[PDB]
Design a protein around this ligand. Structure first.
Ligand SMILES: O=C(O)c1cccnc1C(=O)O
Ligand SMILES: O=C(O)c1cccnc1C(=O)O
Lengths: 284, 284
């Protein structure tokens, strides 16, 4: 479910969402059309198929708008559930005004997160029968990292680092600064020897240069499938304990091809940047 | 450029972005590889074509990380510029450590906002030769509405309402609550007779019923092209002053056909939910 940190990230997001909606005044239109005493049974229903994620975030939105004792959940599906088109994700009974005010914020969050989990489950199916795991990146939206990371996990992927001090990842700009891949690698080993280290290589030459150093992980940056295969062959013979992760020109159509080379992971930025919403509506 | 509200939204976003990155500890890898005294000229360069938006947000991230006197902008492109693949959006000279730490948050913001401006510009080209304007919706991400709304405007779109009290919009759930389309419309007229009112109809029957009431705008919910043409013909004959807006089963491939019917606007939720990042890198 949501973690302590994820829950707090969630409340903060629902709080910013509601404030964007209410900043210009109250919900004049629902105030004018529905009485305070109104109550309904409404359903979060999908207009399309996908994997559901972020259903608790819906409940948190209601808590914020209606208060915990302001609604009742008659039925609900579990996050991670693969779902067909007119499926009712959650049925609840609540004061109508509260629902109509919470609606857009609530729908926007779960449609976004379900979008993420739906995509990641696609990648996960793509590399099935391979040892490869799908991983995310730090290409997340400011303020939503904890929720986006949660959604990929829900769709079956595995999280990469959550931030900069979380783990080390020597990139092209460090190698440049350090003047060398090995230089950079050594430098970070000396500075934070307790920290996981990933080194990013963009060529087979660099790959040969760092394999002996035995870093935890090497990220193959934009390798062609034939280069990824060579990379795997070199690693298997020289440093069996080093893990390989592809990142770069990955597409869902090519994902199995790369996976088949034997790499350990596929790092997919699109899982978090470039997400397509799962279309969900609130039906009363 | 950015307004006071967009500026504050931007600062709030960059602040959330950086905290996500630094929450676990400092940037160990750049601290270990690049000296405090280091300085470079770096460029924000696109890996693909599109429309640029959010460059100011890049400068704001540096202000936050390097301080105003921590960097120098040698060159920059203007927001709204149509840009080719290897184009340099902005070239600057700054302390290297500051750049590497600001990088991901900076790239994530401008890449997102450029993806939005890029897409809205495609719709705008699509309905070119028509009087139709591309508008957005409230289907925005929590905490990013002001920026996303700014971006569609940059791409050539026009913003719809910013929140719930901004303007009235009678939706299906209000119609259900009010029992009738006409009931609902009347109710809001009585309650906020000064505020802008848009009424959403999902049938020509409903359309016929509200046309006489003369609302400011009528949102045609999921009308087929032929129904949109009829709607425009009836509006032109019965209530010339009523403005029509298509929202629903709109696709970039169908955009011009709908625009040609004569509607005044096309409300596109995809512009802000479902956005694909404009790929941009920081080259040193
Ligand atoms: O920083 C990361 O963890 C990361 C890991 C794999 C691929 N990309 C990234 C990135 O955001 O640049
Ligand atoms: O509420 C709005 O502003 C709105 C306006 C046009 C289309 N959709 C919406 C929506 O978010 O439901």
């Amino acid at each position: 479910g949501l973690s302590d940190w994820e829950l707090a990230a969630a409340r903060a997001a629902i709080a910013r969402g509601l404030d964007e909606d209410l900043r210009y005044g109250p919900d004049v239109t629902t105030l004018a059309t529905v009485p305070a005493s109104a109550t309904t049974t409404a359903s979060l229903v999908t207009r399309e198929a996908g994997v559901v994620a972020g259903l608790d975030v819906a409940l948190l939105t209601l808590n914020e708008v209606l208060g915990t004792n302001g609604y009742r959940v008659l039925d609900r599906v579990e996050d991670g559930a693969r779902v067909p088109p007119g499926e009712a994700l959650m049925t609840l009974e609540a004061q109508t005004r509260g629902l109509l005010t919470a609606e857009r914020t609530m729908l926007n969050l779960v449609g976004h997160l379900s979008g993420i989990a739906t995509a990641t489950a696609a990648w996960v199916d793509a590399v099935r029968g391979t040892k490869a795991k799908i991983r995310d990146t730090r290409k997340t939206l400011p303020g939503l990292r904890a929720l986006q990371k949660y959604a990929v996990r829900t769709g079956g992927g595995v999280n990469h680092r959550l931030g900069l001090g979380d783990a080390a990842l020597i990139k092209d700009n460090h190698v440049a600064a350090a003047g060398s891949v090995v230089d950079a690698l050594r430098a970070v080993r000396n500075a934070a020897p307790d920290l996981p280290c990933e080194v990013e290589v963009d060529s087979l030459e660099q790959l040969d240069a760092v394999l002996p150093e035995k870093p935890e992980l090497i990220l193959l940056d934009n390798f062609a499938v034939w280069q990824t295969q060579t990379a795997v062959q070199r690693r298997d013979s020289r440093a069996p304990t080093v893990m390989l992760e592809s990142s770069g020109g990955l597409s869902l159509q090519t994902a199995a091809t790369y996976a088949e080379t034997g790499v350990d992971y596929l790092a997919v930025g699109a899982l978090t940047h470039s997400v397509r919403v799962l279309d969900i509506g609130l039906d009363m």
